[model samples]
Target: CWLCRALIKRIQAMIPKGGRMLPQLVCRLVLRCS
Candidate 1:
């Protein structure tokens, strides 16, 4: 799960502090498929 963890971390960092919710949804779907 390294890649999934890395990918989620990258996405989390890429998202803005105030706009954090989007990454949750995105990572949820991404993780779901991963």
Candidate 2:
């Protein structure tokens, strides 16, 4: 679905300039729920 695509894009964006997976995970969860 489009929502999954949105989260995929966000993950691609966030993963590169990263510290930990938690931030990306949290963002994904928040966006998916929202």
Candidate 3:
């Protein structure tokens, strides 16, 4: 979970203007990490 959150934060910083699929992508990554 720590790694997942860190990755998500990095991605969020990279994509400040998150598009429509950002949430979906983040959720998918979290699931995979878990």
Candidate with top lDDT is 3
TM-score of 1: 0.37
Off by over 4 Å in 2: 17-34
lDDT per model vs. reference: 0.56, 0.56, 0.59
Q: State the lDDT of candidate 3 residue by residue for 1-34, as single tens digits.
A: 5566566667766865764245446667657644
Candidate 2 lDDT tens digits, 1-20: 36665666677666676543
Clash pairs detected, candidate 1: none
Range of the 10 consecutive residues with the lowest summed lDDT in candidate 2: 18-27
Q: Model 1, range 1-34, lDDT digits (tens) per residue?
A: 4555566667776657634344446556656534
Ten consecutive residues with minimal summed lDDT in candidate 3? 18-27
Pairs with backbone N, CA or C atoms under 3 Å apart (clashes), candidate 2? none
Error of 3 at 15 (Å): 1.4
